[model samples]
Target: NLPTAQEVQGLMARYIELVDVGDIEAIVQMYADDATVENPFGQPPIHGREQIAAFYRQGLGGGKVRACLTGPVRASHNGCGAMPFRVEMVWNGQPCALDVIDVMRFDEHGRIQTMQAYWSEVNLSV
Candidate 1:
């Protein structure tokens, strides 16, 4: 069965929640076993749940990284749901933030199968 609009919204909300709380396991659990993620850096897409989980775990655990706040702007279910978010946080003692949009595609079982994110710098001084 296709995911409902509310389900898609919940999925997006849980995603941000996992990121904000640094719940790496819970974050990973949202993905399917064979999920893949394509990030904005033009890097090759990370394949499989293990790789994706490892990537986030490393980043969140890395000392150079700090908190992450994802402020979602919109969400919609059109084949796959798109969630546009503003990411804000402090890193290296300098306040830094970015606007990001993440597209999530869910499988038949309502688990996320594909995720792609785009990021751009936000002008906080304005």
Candidate 2:
């Protein structure tokens, strides 16, 4: 069964909060053991719990990441949800903002099974 819309929205909010705080472990726990991530959509996906943890560690472990939602979380009946957000961080000693949309599909137990992010160079502002 798919997660309820309320549940998906709750997770979406919790997700941005976790990211803002650089809570890598808690963020990783939100995913299923075999979850997959396709950040930016065109890149090769990162699969499974171990890889996912490493991914978050590299990104959020620095404790310099900040993110906020740009719109309401959208939920689908097919165990999926999407949210638009802006990430602010320092890259190469310069501050930048990235506008992104992320879609996540949940498993029966409500863990995220797949996460695809839509963003590109054009979405970034320095």
Candidate 3:
């Protein structure tokens, strides 16, 4: 079923909740089988559920991490939702922080099909 605007808002909220809890597996479940994830900068896109799950595992592998939404998520009628993020973590004993923006497109069933993270190397905490 096509989600209504209200449903879209709820979906964004749900995403935030899942991310804030830092459950990689649960978050991965939010995506479709063929979802694609493109993290900004020189990194290549991560395609398919298995690859995407692997990427997220590595993301959290950076050790203890916290990723919080920076502002309200904007929902587009075209089944897209964009969210700004502030992610902080101690990866390999190096504490790094960065600002990331995730633009997501949902399938009719509301599963995320594509999620592109926006940000450049400039946004990284070096």
Per lDDT, the best of the predicted structures is: 2
Query: Compared with the true structure, what per-residue lDDT tens digits does model 1 show for residues 18-73?
Result: 78777788888888899989876456899888898899987666333333335542
Which digits, one per residue and each the tens of the lDDT, describe model 2 over residues 1-126? 458988898887798998999988889998999999999799999999889999999877777789999999999877789999999999899999999999999999888999999999999999
Overall lDDT per candidate, in order of appearance: 0.71, 0.91, 0.80
lDDT-wise, the better of 1 and 2 is 2
Which 10-residue window of candidate 3 scores lowest in summed lDDT? Answer: 1-10
The reply for model 2, stretches above 4 Å from the true place, is none
Task: Tell me the alpha-carbon RMSD of every candidate.
Answer: 3.3, 1.1, 2.1
Global local distance difference test of model 1 = 0.71
Write model 3 residue lDDT over 1-126, tens digit each, in one string: 555666766786787677667788888998989888888735788889889888888777534777777788888887888878888877668998889888888889889888888888788894
lDDT of 3 at 15: 77
Q: Can you give the lDDT of residue 93 in candidate 1? A: 75
TM-score of each: 0.79, 0.95, 0.86
| C-alpha-based local distance difference test score of model 3 | 0.80
